[PDB]
Design an enzyme around this catalytic site. Structure first.
Site, short mmCIF file in Angstrom:
data_model
loop_
_atom_site.label_atom_id
_atom_site.label_comp_id
_atom_site.label_asym_id
_atom_site.label_seq_id
_atom_site.Cartn_x
_atom_site.Cartn_y
_atom_site.Cartn_z
N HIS A 69 -0.23 5.90 0.47
CA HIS A 69 -1.11 4.78 0.79
C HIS A 69 -0.39 3.73 1.56
O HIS A 69 0.87 3.69 1.59
CB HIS A 69 -1.72 4.19 -0.50
N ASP A 71 -0.56 -0.50 1.50
CA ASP A 71 -1.03 -1.40 0.45
C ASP A 71 -2.23 -2.23 0.80
O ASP A 71 -2.21 -2.86 1.84
CB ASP A 71 0.07 -2.37 0.09
N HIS A 199 3.54 4.42 1.63
CA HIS A 199 4.48 4.70 0.57
C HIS A 199 3.80 5.42 -0.56
O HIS A 199 2.56 5.53 -0.62
CB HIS A 199 5.19 3.42 0.05
N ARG A 214 8.20 -7.03 -7.39
CA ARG A 214 7.77 -7.07 -5.99
C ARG A 214 7.26 -8.43 -5.53
O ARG A 214 6.44 -9.05 -6.20
CB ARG A 214 6.61 -6.06 -5.76
FE LIG Z 1 1.77 0.37 -3.15
#
Ligand SMILES: [Fe+3]
Ligand SMILES: [Fe+3]
Lengths: 240, 236
Positions: A69, A71, A199, A214
């Site tokens: 995907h 994000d 990713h 993150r």
């Molecule tokens: Fe992600």
């Protein structure tokens, strides 16, 4: 500071830098430029980074806010980039994959370029957005493929056709030669250009505890090769 | 004399009020030719007088005299046939119907992204060592309609890999052979079919068990395809 190329299409390691808010703009630029060239960049041994100091570092690059995907592509102005640090890691497994969506466009046969340049997709999560399948990167000018697991269908094709073409494009994007798989150590930091990558986490560590931290940077609305911008069918844009 | 009756919204027509044969009026030949080009496959019923001789002579008036997978005839060749005239000689007691699909309508109904794809795709066709590289979209040399050129003689698409080739071929064939875009004919004695091989695919159906089925075909010469940019198919 130094940048080590990890493979021929994607990925680099950056050495000579303690990440945090105090960084010299000339360094920050070298990082930005390394990121744009290599799509995903790695720093090791950053044991001193904590929550506050990752954020601060992120702030020098831009504006803080399973399946393959990109994000939050179910939103129109999906993130430009993220900074991910390892916090506690499992004793085995848990590596992460990235794919270069600019390299993937650039190596399409001409006919598939003509196809993707003109193709648009509905992404969803409620959020529904029609995005072009080929965006012009606002900083680099590279055309990048925009697909991944949020895609529900392609505008103007049926279910069966959408799924088949989705798989065709995903197979090119995720071809091993176009991807890097990172083995996470303590003090590892990754930064990726979400406008030119996909990713995927790997769930290969049984039910072991794993924790990362993150920080995500705000991104813009894609435009296609003609300049047309993505279209919100449903939901709000992302905001700070 | 002659009437042309549409059989489906996208393909096929029956022509009555015409004894086929070498003896036909030029206006009659032209009115047939017109229908053939508009309707892609046309049928004449009760042609009990026709024989090999009279079919070839009739065929000669249209142009120049030279299966249960969907295909366009002899596309492994560069200058594959323009058209064919086919008569039932001996039909089985059941089964034996035939399918045509309209490859001009199929192009025309493609979503634009897919038109882009096909306008630029070339396919390697093969079969005793024939190999031609044809455009996937050819420009019809009498009607100027763009038509999909694919079918079972396609091995791969140029610059695409094996998996990709197959998958896209199946996407195309699925649109071409959608039932709305096709006609299935139940042959009766005396029946004659003519189809434009530059804007169709056809398929025989093997649903008559062992039985013997005999047809007589006369094929007409066609020219080399060109794509939408004027480029000619290339012999390998
Ligand atoms: Fe992600
Ligand atoms: Fe045939």
């Amino acid at each position: 500071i130094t940048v080590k190329k990890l493979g021929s299409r994607i990925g680099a390691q950056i050495d000579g830098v303690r990440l945090g808010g105090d960084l010299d703009p000339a360094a920050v630029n070298e990082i930005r430029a390394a990121l744009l060239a290599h799509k995903v960049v790695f720093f090791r041994g950053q044991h001193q980074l904590d929550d506050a100091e990752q954020l601060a570092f992120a702030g020098l690059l831009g504006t803080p806010i399973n399946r393959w995907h990109t994000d939050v592509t179910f939103a129109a102005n999906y993130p430009a980039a993220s900074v991910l640090r390892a916090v506690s890691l499992p004793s085995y497994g848990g590596s992460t994959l990235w794919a270069n969506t600019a390299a993937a466009y650039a190596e399409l046969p001409e006919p598939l370029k003509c196809l993707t340049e003109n193709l648009w997709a509905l992404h969803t999560n409620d959020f529904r957005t029609e995005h072009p399948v080929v965006r012009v990167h606002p900083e680099t000018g590279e055309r990048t493929l925009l697909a991944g697991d949020f895609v529900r269908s392609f505008v103007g094709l049926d279910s069966h056709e959408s799924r088949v073409l989705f798989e065709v494009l995903q197979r090119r994007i995720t071809m091993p030669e176009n991807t890097i798989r990172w083995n996470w150590a303590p003090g590892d930091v990754a930064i990726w250009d979400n406008r030119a990558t996909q990713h995927r986490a790997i769930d290969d560590y049984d039910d072991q505890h794993r924790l990362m931290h993150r920080v995500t940077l705000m991104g813009d609305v894609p435009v296609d090769v003609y300049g047309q911008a993505s279209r919100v069918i449903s939901g709000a844009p992302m905001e700070i």
